[PDB]
């Protein structure tokens, strides 16, 4: 930035006390343009979801361990 207001548009003007003349130093409201590049992504919409079964656990942080036990007769 060389000048404080180069890339910005000028919208409003704050005049001191009353809106009379141009003598007052004044305040200028400047605007900028913002763009968001995000594209929405969902795990249940990815093709990848078929591979795994998803269960929501409200308080996993409490869980110290988990296990499954198989019993196989031959």
């Amino acid at each position: 930035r060389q000048s404080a207001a180069e890339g910005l548009f000028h919208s409003f003007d704050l005049l001191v006390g009353k809106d009379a003349r141009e003598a007052g130093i004044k305040f200028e409201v400047l605007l900028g343009v913002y763009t968001n590049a995000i594209q929405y992504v969902r795990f249940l919409e990815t093709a990848l979801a078929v591979s795994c079964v998803n269960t929501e656990f409200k308080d996993l942080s409490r869980m110290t361990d988990g296990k499954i036990q198989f019993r196989i007769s031959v």
Binding site: E6, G7, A37, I38, Q39
Partner: protein
């Protein structure tokens, strides 16, 4: 956007960039020549075929 990583030591901060674009200016010229005989017989007035 950004991916949230666990093994990475400190979570990556969200990113925003400021990009300043400049507008170029191109100027275009042409020249047309016109004769004084035209520019005069125009100011005159016709009366006869």
């Amino acid at each position: 956007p950004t991916i949230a990583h666990g093994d990475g030591r400190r979570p990556s901060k969200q990113r925003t960039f400021i990009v300043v674009k400049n507008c170029h200016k191109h100027h275009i010229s042409t020249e047309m020549e016109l004769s004084m005989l035209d520019l005069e017989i125009l100011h005159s007035i016709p009366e006869t075929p």
